[PDB]
Design a protein around this ligand. Structure first.
Ligand SMILES: [Zn+2]
Ligand SMILES: [Zn+2]
Ligand SMILES: [Zn+2]
Lengths: 227, 93, 111, 175, 161, 56, 64, 208, 196
């Protein structure tokens, strides 16, 4: 099957044999080759258009940096918590030798819930000015590993109403370990980070939106190419 | 005295097999240690044979005392004679 | 069993208060201190039996080199089982057998 | 000697998880996977993995002189492609319970007739037997995990001049 | 099917010895050596580097040579009068020669400078008899007799002096 | 099989030389003979040294 | 207990070699380096695992 | 009581621009991270049949060509499908199949690959904002998913086994050559030339 | 990885690890911290795989007590670098770099050779210490030295490969020496004369 025409024909054959998820009879027709078990539900596998412009990294805590293990930290941040789901990370590097990550979160449950609800409901062109203040919690040592291929890792999110599954690329993996600050460097530590950070929600500028659309034009040119 | 307590559980079967008395072990500990350690011992009828001790940061000191006690407390017998067997000898008289 | 520090993950050494007369587990790398629940600071076993039956795995019934008996299972009363001796390998170790059923996979003796 | 890269590719294809994604508290029942003495990952269903590796080796996908060892007691799964390992060939007994041929040799009179002729009925030599799954090589380390019948007469259950064979009555049945 | 007799086992053993022989390990190891090991050993340290920051107008000059491919030949014999001819093991045994073949290596030279090459004979490697690089591997039964070699001889050894 | 303490599993040869040994018995008997040869060829030097010291 | 040992270190003031002596006192957790020619004295704290190389490296760090 | 190190209270008035999302997760902000196997590739670009036909590469090495063919036919793709009503719709060749036991499987064409899910704690997805140098979290990665071939009889597994078996069979580095003269001839002739030019250079230097 | 201390003698049963190009043995906790995992709990997580086994934890306790003096990665690397048998008087930063080199390379080279890949080295160190503890606690017999599946045979191939490696290194050194001598004369050498 080294013929390019044969490969193209195989591609169109694979494209044409997609089973409609709403077709229950055809779904039950499909049988597992080994398990011999009928299919129950199906979901389409599609890429995500609005997230290709952004850069995504899989962030993990290694060892004792686990939030569940740190019981007082978990109790302070709430026993899924919206504070964890809306946390901020601020990488600051004084020099190549010394590096760490700054973690911020919303202590108040109501403010974090309002911010999370506002962030997860962005489908219109009206955003309220939510001046949310983030408080520093802890710092960790970081290491980074890069992926040679673009789509080495991908996270899958589901959508039951549309029977689809949206996947996003992963650029790299970030690992964090607990860092004990040296007592002789606390004077310089106090001058690096901040006790509070205020986040203001504003509508994106036209030029930045055009830049992001130009970046997305690589994936989807039908609905986003400039005219 | 100190709040730290030291109690050791001794096997009843092997203690009876060696034909030893708890009072004898108590006197041995008292002799080797004078009044530096207060000692109490459960009676014969106890379900589990135990003998406690109390001193008169000292957790490590008590650990070293316990290790020394386990190591070199000689109840009875000739030192160096690890085991003894009974043998029958056929002798012409 | 010994506990670890909840803030810097080091070992919690026991400590005694002179004024309060309490046993407390304290980390020497910080000021964290948690109240001890039991007074059992240390326990040493001169003669121990741990590791005799602790060497058990859940896939031991797939080993073809193990002998197969017909002893009765105490739980599900199966007619097939796999036996072996003690996993501890000291000179004083007994020659008693441990039987493993092929359905419930529990370890039981014959006495 | 054989390269270990296809072995790692096959292992990663069949569900092996690397060391960086491994937590000893979470994985209290996973099997450590060694390749040429290097701990490369872990797995939670070692039976399917060892079955797949052995079937691939018996089909010629993996080189026949590669060692596949499963230590059930220590929860380890070791693979060796090193140079200098001494091995010997053995007949393979069909050990699949779901098969009808359970407890019987895989080699039949058809294989013997093909060997005598010298070709297959649509060169047929020793290598054809090895890559057909009726013969395989085992080294001294893999021998510790297998059960070997001395003669094909041993696979099925008062003269003063004939030698006497062991009873082997300690086990009710032998596989 | 039908049962497998002891004669079938001896048929299988005969197939084994027909394919492998009795000295297969020696020949296979030597063939692996000659085929890949020499090239890998050469490519272990493939770059010799010499630098000279000449100041005598600072010119930093790096001189480096790369090792390329390994070329092997069938064993040859060079006479005192200068001629050459193909060597065979019986002649090496009779005249106390060494049965060995020349090894050639590609050396590439480059002249790096910053202001701020063909086959070389590297030696002769003795050849194991009846291996892939021996002259007797191809010869059939008749030419083996013409070469005064015994057909029962199995190889697996070297001829030094 | 594992954990077998029967006589045939641990080196008891129940056949005679006239009857013929089984392969397991053959291997165990070869192990014992190897022990004998090693013991002789190892103790000879110690015995010779003792004899020399006694003579001197 | 003070421990006096002859070392083959090089003094950075007099440049004479094999004229460095390390004196460490484990009881008070101190270590003294004295130059047999320069008569200079260097003091640095020591730990339970301390060795003369530790005090020598500490002196090197202090000198620069 | 570990006192808080930071008490200055200095605050940055930084405002981040955020774009609307084409989809929103419902009930749980959970995503599953999936490792990409060697036999599977992701083609986010829309399927263009004519460039795909015009860019097929043929190599002498059968194993490399077979691997490229397998990964190309197994590549996840998508394309625009013209609806019968005149509209345009996104059409894909990949689906997710859930069996009765609750397990999930990724399906591309007739090939089905099983999913093995391992629960992971304290694993989240973040979005990098390089222009501001901060990382904004997105959701939680609860489970890690590995892709495993369904069975031996699957064509993908057979092609992978064939490619990996025949890949290590080809091994021949040394190239044969024919020697027509004595190898040491180059060495002796260059020694003679070097000695001649040494004598000429010595004569010139004595005459200089 | 030696296990010092006899039964009921020598106070604590410390575990010291011998390292290449290091003059004196090193406790396991210090090298574990040097690799880049400081907390003692995670060191025990790497070493032991079942928390209910109090005996191995008790045997590791003296090592934790001895290694408590070191509490940072950089001081641990420096402590490695002092004993690294290098030239006396090397500066602290250069000592730390030397320790990083001797830790990345020549410490379990068969695992990996690249930077930032020391997680597998820590896991393998935990595995070795676990095997040492399992043998020390009479849970397993010591390894059979005479077992034949742990042996290898070197045929003509490997022996000739080792010999050819030595001879080729000698030839390369001769080529290097001749090149150094020839660059004095500054001539366009034919390169067919350097090779012997
Ligand atoms: Zn603490
Ligand atoms: Zn049962
Ligand atoms: Zn001086």
């Amino acid at each position: 099957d080294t013929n390019p025409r044969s490969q193209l024909h195989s591609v169109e054959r694979t494209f044409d044999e997609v089973i409609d998820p709403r077709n229950k009879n055809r779904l039950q027709s499909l049988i597992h080759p080994r398990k011999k078990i009928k299919a129950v539900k199906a979901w389409h596998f599609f890429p995500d258009t609005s997230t290709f412009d952004q850069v995504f990294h899989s962030l993990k805590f290694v060892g004792s940096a686990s939030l569940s293990k740190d019981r007082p930290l978990n109790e302070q941040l709430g026993q899924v918590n919206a504070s964890i789901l809306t946390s901020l990370f601020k990488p600051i590097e004084i020099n190549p030798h010394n590096k760490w990550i700054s973690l911020y979160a919303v202590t108040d449950k109501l403010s974090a819930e309002s911010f999370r609800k506002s962030f997860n409901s962005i489908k219109d062109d009206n955003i309220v000015n939510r001046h949310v203040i983030y408080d520093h919690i802890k710092d960790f040592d970081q290491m980074f590993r890069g992926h040679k291929k673009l789509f080495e890792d991908f996270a899958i999110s589901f959508d039951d109403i549309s029977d689809r599954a949206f996947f996003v690329p992963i650029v790299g993996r970030l690992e964090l370990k607990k860092k004990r600050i040296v007592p002789g460097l606390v004077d310089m530590v106090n001058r690096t980070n901040y006790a509070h950070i205020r986040m203001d929600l504003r509508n994106p500028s036209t030029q930045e939106t055009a830049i992001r659309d130009s970046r997305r034009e690589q994936y989807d040119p039908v609905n986003y190419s400039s005219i | 005295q100190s709040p730290w307590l030291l109690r050791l559980e001794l096997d009843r079967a092997r203690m009876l097999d060696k034909q030893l008395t708890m009072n004898q072990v108590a006197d041995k500990i008292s002799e080797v240690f004078s009044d530096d350690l207060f000692v109490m011992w459960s009676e014969d009828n106890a379900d589990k044979l135990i003998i406690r001790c109390r001193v008169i940061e000292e957790d490590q000191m008590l650990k070293r005392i316990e290790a020394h006690m386990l190591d070199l407390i000689a109840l009875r017998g000739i030192p160096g004679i690890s085991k003894v067997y009974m043998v029958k000898h056929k002798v012409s008289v | 069993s010994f506990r670890f520090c909840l803030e810097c993950n080091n070992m919690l050494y026991p400590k005694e208060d002179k004024e309060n007369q309490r046993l407390l587990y304290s980390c020497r790398n910080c000021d964290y201190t948690e109240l001890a629940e039991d007074p059992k600071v240390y326990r040493h076993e001169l003669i121990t039996n741990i590791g005799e039956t602790a060497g058990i795995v859940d896939d031991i019934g797939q080993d073809p080199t193990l002998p197969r008996s017909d002893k009765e299972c105490p739980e599900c009363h199966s007619r097939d089982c796999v036996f072996f001796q003690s996993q501890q390998r000291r000179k004083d170790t007994n020659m008693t057998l441990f039987y493993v059923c092929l359905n419930c996979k529990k370890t039981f003796r014959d006495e | 000697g054989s390269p270990s890269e296809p072995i790692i590719n096959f292992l990663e294809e069949w569900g092996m998880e690397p060391l960086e994604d491994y937590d000893p508290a979470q994985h209290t029942k996973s099997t450590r996977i060694f390749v040429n003495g290097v701990w490369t990952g872990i797995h939670r269903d070692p039976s399917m993995l060892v079955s797949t590796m052995r079937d691939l080796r018996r089909s010629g996908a993996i080189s026949p002189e590669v060692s596949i060892i499963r230590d059930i007691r220590e929860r380890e799964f070791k693979i060796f492609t090193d140079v200098g390992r001494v091995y010997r060939p053995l007949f393979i007994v069909e050990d699949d319970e779901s098969k009808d041929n359970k407890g019987e040799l895989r080699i039949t009179k058809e294989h013997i007739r093909k060997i005598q002729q010298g070709y297959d009925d649509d060169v047929y030599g020793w290598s054809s037997l090895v890559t057909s799954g009726v013969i395989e090589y085992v080294d001294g380390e893999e021998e510790e995990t297998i059960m070997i019948a001395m003669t094909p007469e041993d696979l099925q259950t008062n003269d003063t001049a004939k030698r006497i064979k062991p009873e082997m009555s300690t086990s009710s049945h032998h596989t | 099917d039908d049962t497998i007799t002891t004669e079938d086992c001896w048929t299988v053993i005969s197939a084994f010895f027909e394919e492998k022989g009795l000295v297969s390990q020696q020949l296979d190891s030597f063939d692996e050596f000659m085929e890949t090991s020499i090239q890998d050993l050469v490519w272990e340290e493939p770059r010799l580097i010499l630098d000279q920051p000449a100041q005598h107008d600072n010119i930093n000059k790096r001189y480096e040579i790369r090792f390329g491919k390994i070329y092997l030949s069938r064993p040859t014999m060079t006479e005192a009068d200068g001629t050459t001819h193909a060597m065979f093991p019986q002649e090496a045994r009779l005249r106390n020669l060494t049965y060995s073949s020349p090894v050639y290596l590609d050396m590439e030279k480059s002249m790096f400078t910053s202001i701020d090459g063909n086959k070389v004979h590297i030696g002769k490697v003795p050849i194991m008899l009846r291996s892939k690089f021996c002259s007797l591997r191809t010869l059939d039964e008749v030419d083996l007799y013409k070469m005064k070699e015994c057909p029962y001889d199995m190889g697996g050894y070297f001829v030094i002096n | 099989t594992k954990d077998d303490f029967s006589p045939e599993s641990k080196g008891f040869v129940e056949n005679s030389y006239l009857r013929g040994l089984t392969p397991q018995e053959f291997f165990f008997h070869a192990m014992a003979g190897r022990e004998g040869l090693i013991d002789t060829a190892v103790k000879t030097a110690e015995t010779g040294y003792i004899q020399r010291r006694l003579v001197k | 207990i003070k421990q006096k040992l002859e070392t083959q270190f090089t003094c950075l003031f007099c440049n004479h070699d094999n004229s460095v002596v390390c004196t460490l006192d484990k009881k008070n957790s101190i270590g003294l380096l004295e130059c047999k020619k320069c008569n200079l004295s260097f003091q640095a704290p020591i730990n339970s695992l301390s060795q003369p190389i530790d005090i020598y490296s500490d002196w090197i760090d202090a000198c620069e | 009581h570990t006192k808080s190190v930071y008490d200055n209270g200095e605050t940055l008035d930084i405002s981040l621009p955020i774009h609307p999302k084409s989809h929103i997760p419902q009930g749980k902000q959970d995503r599953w991270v999936v490792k990409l196997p060697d036999f599977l590739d992701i083609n986010a670009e829309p399927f263009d049949p004519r460039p795909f036909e015009m860019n097929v590469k043929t190599h002498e090495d059968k194993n490399q060509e077979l691997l490229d063919k397998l990964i190309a036919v197994n590549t996840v793709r998508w394309r625009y499908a013209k609806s019968e009503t005149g509209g345009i719709f996104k059409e894909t060749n990949s689906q997710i199949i859930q069996w009765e036991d609750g397990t999930y499987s990724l399906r591309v064409g007739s090939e089905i690959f099983d999913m093995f899910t391992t629960n992971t704690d304290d694993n989240y997805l973040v979005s990098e904002h390089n222009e501001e140098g901060i990382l904004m979290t997105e959701s939680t990665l609860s489970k890690s998913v590995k892709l495993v071939p369904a069975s031996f009889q699957s064509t993908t597994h057979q092609k992978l086994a064939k490619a990996l078996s025949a890949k290590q069979k080809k091994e021949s580095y040394a190239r044969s050559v024919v020697t027509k003269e004595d190898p040491e001839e180059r060495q002796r002739r260059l020694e003679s030339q070097e000695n001649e030019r040494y004598r000429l250079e010595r004569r010139r230097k004595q005459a200089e | 990885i030696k296990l010092y201390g006899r039964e009921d003698k020598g106070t604590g049963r410390t575990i010291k690890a011998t390292l290449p190009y290091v003059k004196q043995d090193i406790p396991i906790v210090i090298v574990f911290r040097a690799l880049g995992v400081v907390p003692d709990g995670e060191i025990l997580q790497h070493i032991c795989y079942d928390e209910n086994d109090w005996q191995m934890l008790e045997m590791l306790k003296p090592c934790i007590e001895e290694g408590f003096v070191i509490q940072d990665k950089e001081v641990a690397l420096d402590f490695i670098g002092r004993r690294g048998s290098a030239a006396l008087g090397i500066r602290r930063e250069k000592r730390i770099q030397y320790a990083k080199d001797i830790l990345q390379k020549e410490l379990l080279p068969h695992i990996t050779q690249e930077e930032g890949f020391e997680t597998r080295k820590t896991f393998f160190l935990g595995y070795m210490v676990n095997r040492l503890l399992l043998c020390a606690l009479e849970r397993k017999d010591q390894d059979d030295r005479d077992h034949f599946g742990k042996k290898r045979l070197d045929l003509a191939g490997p022996l000739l490969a080792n010999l050819f490696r030595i001879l080729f290194r000698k030839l390369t050194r001769e080529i290097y020496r001749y090149m150094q001598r020839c660059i004095e004369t500054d001539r366009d050498f034919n390169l067919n004369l350097a090779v012997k």
